[PDB]
């Protein structure tokens, strides 16, 4: 029953992003989880939270988020770097090499 205004979505996003820059990944994740609980389609938030989960060592969650973004945000190299890191956190090193190679190919969009 709770709805966020644009400014409020921006506020949490910016707080999550700022905590992530401080090396405070749990705080980042808590803020971004709240945002993504209420606005699941906030893409910048999905990305920021995805990297925060990768730094707070939540590889299975990070994985599901990365495939989510790949299926929803396309041709984006960073999604593949996130998948690679999440896959390497889960012990699927080879899955991470395929993901990292996809990352290199689209970083090659230059």
């Amino acid at each position: 029953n709770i709805t966020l205004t644009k400014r409020q979505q921006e506020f949490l996003l910016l707080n999550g992003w700022l905590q992530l820059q401080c090396g405070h990944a749990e705080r980042a994740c808590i803020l971004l989880d709240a945002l993504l609980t209420l606005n699941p389609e906030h893409l910048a938030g999905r990305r920021c939270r995805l990297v925060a989960l990768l730094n707070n060592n939540q590889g299975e969650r990070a994985e599901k988020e990365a495939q989510w973004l790949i299926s929803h945000d396309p041709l984006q190299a960073g999604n593949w770097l996130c998948l690679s890191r999440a896959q390497q956190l889960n012990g699927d090193l080879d899955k991470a090499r395929h993901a990292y190679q996809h990352y290199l190919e689209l970083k090659d969009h230059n």
């Binding site: 400014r7 409020q8 949490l12 996003l13 910016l14 992530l20 808590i30 990305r47």
Partner: protein, 76 residues
């Protein structure tokens, strides 16, 4: 496998929201959204929302403390 300065720059750029919080007075608008949002999210029954509300209350009180410190550094 390991990170690369290029790897982390791509990570930052990926996570970075860029310009956000679109307003004309960052200071008043920030304290206002922080206070509004912190009192709004406690009313959630969701565990995920409740945690965010707690952290916001924290920065709200750390700001009250830093305001006390800032006053002390004005006078000499």
């Amino acid at each position: 496998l390991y990170p690369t300065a290029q790897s982390k720059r791509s990570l930052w750029d990926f996570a970075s929201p860029g310009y956000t919080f679109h307003g004309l007075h960052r200071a008043q608008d920030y304290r206002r959204e922080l206070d509004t949002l912190q009192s709004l999210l406690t009313t959630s029954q969701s565990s995920e929302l409740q945690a965010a509300a707690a952290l916001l209350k924290c920065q709200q009180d750390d700001d009250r403390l830093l305001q006390i410190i800032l006053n002390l550094l004005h006078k000499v």
